[PDB]
Structure 1
Amino acid sequence: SPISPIETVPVKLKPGMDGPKVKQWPLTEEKIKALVEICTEMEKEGKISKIGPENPYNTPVFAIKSTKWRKLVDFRELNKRTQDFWEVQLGIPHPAGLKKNKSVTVLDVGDAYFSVPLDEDFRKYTAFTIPSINNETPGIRYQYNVLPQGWKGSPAIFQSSMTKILEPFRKQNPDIVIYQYMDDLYVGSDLEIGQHRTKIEELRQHLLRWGLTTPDKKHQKEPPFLWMGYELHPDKWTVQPIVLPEKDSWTVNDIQKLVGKLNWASQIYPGIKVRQLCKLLRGTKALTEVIPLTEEAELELAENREILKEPVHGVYYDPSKDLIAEIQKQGQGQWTYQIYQEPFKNLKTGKYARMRGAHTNDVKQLTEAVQKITTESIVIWGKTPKFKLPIQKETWETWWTEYWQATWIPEWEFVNTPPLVKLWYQLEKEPIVGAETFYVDGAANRETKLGKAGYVTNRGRQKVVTLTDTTNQKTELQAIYLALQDSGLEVNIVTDSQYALGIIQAQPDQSESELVNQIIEQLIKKEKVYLAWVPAHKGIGGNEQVDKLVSAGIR
């Protein structure tokens, strides 16, 4: 097993700290014997070398079980003391971003970490001791000359070395695509099943020249490749087999495992839903507690089963074509999407269902799903897709201009796939002449938690309800709600709550507050609503009236 002629990577320890000095626990005789067999074998290969107790450092060893042993070194203390390293990656490729190729080959590196050397000045800190039968003799002491299993820096340095090894070959084979992943290499090209086989062996030679053994023609894996939960053919890809078990009883754990599988499947299976299954996990219980399935959850499971009926795959990326992203409202809070280049041959699918803030509408949700997909596309393809959205340009146009937040959807086009996205009500810009002007206000006593909500109008009317466990904010929303309840199809409402105005002004059509949803229910039933704000306690006609009317016995 070759030990590679690479340059070395200068490793240090975390500033101020000295190397580990953890005592070796005495082991059993079969364990001590097994370690000697292993260590002397590694010694002859150059993997480890003998030292003496002049070297002050120690890391414990162990042996586990089969009819032969493996040696385990617990580098916990050295790992705590070794410097921080650059991350071994910033992200993992999505199959959907891979170019299509005629041939693709897997080469795993023979004995990964042990093939690459360790910095001389750090080798001393990897010292371990094989002890004698009891207290007895001083033990046999070794240090590593190669990257050790389970050591903090081995991942990064091995990967660093591999990049440097491939560099020349890459630059003299520009139309050859290679991907490093742990102790694997995936190599693809567009040349025929003849000179492609040739080109692998040129690479294998380049690797053996740098002390890395890779399987030959007869021993290398065949397509499709299982990788990180994918199946990868040279021209298509899909997620690995999803199987939703039919159970009499569903435990939290089962539902959790189901949701995870569905979430995973959703990368390529269109229309996957998980809201109803997820709902069950809220404010939960033990892993083993049986959750009775909700009717809507049962409906969701059946739908998902149906979608996963027959296998579906994804295609690979073509750099010469644009990307098309299509998005659909799947129900409440749920949004589903597909990305393709050629009509309906998907590169990948996906779902969005987030809840950005308490109160939202479909136009806000739709544009948030657009940003999520936009980021994703940059990561996977290095460009933004053309969007096709279930919303009218004018519906969108209207929302953007009037809204206080800045927004930007890249190039898109309307597509008539119901449900279509629309606003459900709109507040007037001008107060309605010949409509009843409600002045609303709330009040809440902070210690008691009691409150009053009410209104006085320009037409003499006057109501005041009492509420028991409340906050000022809730009372204002209640007061505004009252004004809508007893007003009919055309109303002016003046409030002194910016909080309240803020929520309503941004046309929400769903909330995490039941009260706010009641207000929405009322606002749609209306025909013309004007809402306006006045400052609290500045001698305003109707405002001072309701305030005194709700402040009766409360403040």
Structure 2
Amino acid sequence: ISPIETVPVKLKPGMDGPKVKQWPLTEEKIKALVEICTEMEKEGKISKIGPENPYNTPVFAIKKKDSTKWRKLVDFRELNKRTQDFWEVQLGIPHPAGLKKKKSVTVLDVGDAYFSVPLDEDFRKYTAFTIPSINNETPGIRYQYNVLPQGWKGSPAIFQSSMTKILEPFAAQNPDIVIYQYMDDLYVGSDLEIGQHRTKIEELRQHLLRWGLTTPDKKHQKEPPFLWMGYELHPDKWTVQPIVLPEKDSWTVNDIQKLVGKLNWASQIYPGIKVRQLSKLLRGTKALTEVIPLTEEAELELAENREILKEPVHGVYYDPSKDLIAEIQKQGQGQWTYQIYQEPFKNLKTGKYARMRGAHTNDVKQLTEAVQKITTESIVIWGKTPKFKLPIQKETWETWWTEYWQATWIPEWEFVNTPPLVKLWYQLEKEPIVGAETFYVDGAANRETKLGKAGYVTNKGRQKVVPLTNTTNQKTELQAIYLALQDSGLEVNIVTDSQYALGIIQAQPDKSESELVNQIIEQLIKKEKVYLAWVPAHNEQVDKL
């Protein structure tokens, strides 16, 4: 316990406290339980009140740290379900690339933290538990908690705000030293002459101890580099704790999930990691442990990642005096790579963007999406936005955004001449073309018959119809346009009654997960001038039915 001010905790509106069964357990367990229980009553963590309390929560006794020392713990489920909500314990973690080099860093893990914070008095009656002697044929003893019980709903957040309040006085007396908080740890940084930093660490330790919170009195901090939340934090660099990529013959769903996870985790500091073909496999079905054979593309991606990974790479820490740069490169199949740095020799961090949605995608729209994702990330990590280095020409961009149907904001950015440059590969005409043949295209299919036709009729009197198997109304609508393109000169006007086809083509896509649309793309790139116009049905549409 401690003279800390408790936080008031009420139960959920109109709820009663737990009144749960206590089935007797092994006699050995009961013995060890009474031993540790009366030992922590002596320390004021729990008291013993028998008569009037009608509440009860079950206790269990196990041995996970077999120090000839059992462990009591309480299933606080039914109580947790009945206690109010709290301020959400901090969701997320600080990324190392937003940390600033401090001349010295100490880590302090607070011992038995929750048990050292008092619990609001009028709530303690709701933590009562019982110990039976002989199959309940002889009564038992009943206790309750005076402190934050292990794994209760309010324990972590109440602990956090108690800790913050205990820190405030020391922080006021020590503006030059910096203390970040995490579940049980303090991370204390300073730019003081090392002797002063050590004296300050002992001052903070004695402060905490006088507030009831113990701290490692040894050569305390597991020294740098620090193994923190899957990270190596080195005095002047950070990286990820090494990632072992297993070599196996067969692969389960769970194992591919673990592999894709380790790879994306690695991708924040290892440049060039791809996961497209790895995760394409899991995206297939919702099977939980089905044996998925590895594919050819997935295996080359795994080889390339394995070759990136067996060599060490690190990141630098943030310096607010030196500005912030983000640079973007394309890879292929809607995969993009990027780096955040302040100097071009060492990165603050790296990352990948994947066009997830949209089967009819565009290189420039994707690049925009990547600039957006980076911008959000930088607002989170550093509190400002990068200056961007982008493989796109200014005329290209100014042309795209001015004609695009959405509104799109483009921060301060500088063109970089590194291939593969990002361009637009074709542009439809704004008005029909004089002296160019006009193709009235249309196509049709049957839902149940699954056969279809696609054709065109031209002003020169040219007509074609082509049959197709296992196609849809939409696929033949695009096939009719593809026919018009195939059979036309370098300037062609095309007329379709398919608003879906007009929508697809007018989206100026660069690649698709659809062979037909890629062939239309290659045709449109090949053509010199193409005006595409739309009309409704009910022309040549009736002849291809």
How does the TM-score come out when normalised to structure 2?
A: 0.94
CA distance in 2, matches of 1:287, 1:84: 33
On the 8 A contact 1:189/1:196 being kept in 2, the answer is yes
On the 8 A contact 1:442/1:547 being kept in 2, the answer is no
Instruction: Write out per-residue CA displacement over residues 262-285 of structure 1, whole angstroms, 9 at most, x where no aligned residue.
Output: 111111111112223223334258
- For 1:457-536, list aligned pairs within 5 A: 457-536=458-537
The change in CA–CA distance for 1:354 and 1:545 in structure 2 (over 3 A counts) is closer
Q: Which moved more, 1:514-523 or 1:278-287?
A: 278-287
Task: Note the C-alpha offset of 1:50.
Answer: 0.7
Superposition RMSD in Å: 2.0
Helix, strand or coil at the partner of 1:159: helix
Task: Note the C-alpha offset of 1:261.
Answer: 1.5
The change in CA–CA distance for 1:199 and 1:297 in structure 2 (over 3 A counts) is same
On the 8 A contact 2:108/2:220 being kept in 1, the answer is no
Task: Note the C-alpha offset of 1:29.
Answer: 0.8
Task: Note the C-alpha offset of 1:183.
Answer: 0.7
The change in CA–CA distance for 1:369 and 1:174 in structure 2 (over 3 A counts) is same
The change in CA–CA distance for 1:293 and 1:446 in structure 2 (over 3 A counts) is closer
The change in CA–CA distance for 1:153 and 1:29 in structure 2 (over 3 A counts) is same
CA distance in 2, matches of 1:153, 1:442: 65
Helix, strand or coil at the partner of 1:339: strand
The change in CA–CA distance for 1:305 and 1:450 in structure 2 (over 3 A counts) is closer
Q: Which moved more, 1:349-358 or 1:397-406?
A: 349-358
CA distance in 2, matches of 1:246, 1:24: 48
Percent identical pairs in the alignment equals 99
Instruction: Write out per-residue CA displacement over residues 195-222 of structure 1, whole angstroms, 9 at most, x where no aligned residue.
Output: 0001111111221121111112533321
CA distance in 2, matches of 1:251, 1:26: 42
Task: Note the C-alpha offset of 1:449.
Answer: 4.9
Instruction: Write out per-residue CA displacement over residues 442-473 of structure 1, whole angstroms, 9 at most, x where no aligned residue.
Output: 34445555544332211112223344555433
On the 8 A contact 1:456/1:546 being kept in 2, the answer is no
- For 1:280-359, list aligned pairs within 5 A: 280-283=281-284, 291-359=292-360
Task: Note the C-alpha offset of 1:477.
Answer: 1.9
Task: Note the C-alpha offset of 1:426.
Answer: 1.2
CA distance in 2, matches of 1:85, 1:500: 52
Instruction: Write out per-residue CA displacement over residues 327-381 of structure 1, whole angstroms, 9 at most, x where no aligned residue.
Output: 1112221111111011231100111113232211111111101100000000000
Instruction: Write out per-residue CA displacement over residues 381-422 of structure 1, whole angstroms, 9 at most, x where no aligned residue.
Output: 000001001111111111111111111121111111111111
On the 8 A contact 2:453/2:544 being kept in 1, the answer is no
On the 8 A contact 1:102/1:235 being kept in 2, the answer is no
Task: Note the C-alpha offset of 1:240.
Answer: 0.4
On the 8 A contact 2:454/2:544 being kept in 1, the answer is no
Task: Note the C-alpha offset of 1:317.
Answer: 0.4
On the 8 A contact 1:456/1:545 being kept in 2, the answer is no
CA distance in 2, matches of 1:109, 1:157: 15
Helix, strand or coil at the partner of 2:8: coil
CA distance in 2, matches of 1:75, 1:346: 46
Task: Note the C-alpha offset of 1:502.
Answer: 1.7
Q: Which moved more, 1:475-484 or 1:107-116?
A: 475-484
On the 8 A contact 1:100/1:317 being kept in 2, the answer is yes
The alignment status of 1:236 with 2:237, answered yes or no, reads yes
Q: How many residues align?
A: 541
Instruction: Write out per-residue CA displacement over residues 227-262 of structure 1, whole angstroms, 9 at most, x where no aligned residue.
Output: 110011232111101222334444444433222221
CA distance in 2, matches of 1:8, 1:547: 83
Gap runs ≥5 in structure 2: none
The change in CA–CA distance for 1:182 and 1:547 in structure 2 (over 3 A counts) is farther
The change in CA–CA distance for 1:514 and 1:84 in structure 2 (over 3 A counts) is farther
Helix, strand or coil at the partner of 1:56: coil
On the 8 A contact 1:104/1:188 being kept in 2, the answer is yes
How does the TM-score come out when normalised to structure 1?
A: 0.93
Gap runs ≥5 in structure 1: 538-542, 550-555
The change in CA–CA distance for 1:357 and 1:297 in structure 2 (over 3 A counts) is closer
The change in CA–CA distance for 1:510 and 1:445 in structure 2 (over 3 A counts) is same
On the 8 A contact 2:441/2:540 being kept in 1, the answer is no
The change in CA–CA distance for 1:188 and 1:487 in structure 2 (over 3 A counts) is same
The change in CA–CA distance for 1:86 and 1:425 in structure 2 (over 3 A counts) is same
Helix, strand or coil at the partner of 1:437: strand
Task: Note the C-alpha offset of 1:293.
Answer: 4.2
CA distance in 2, matches of 1:350, 1:519: 33
CA distance in 2, matches of 1:7, 1:230: 36
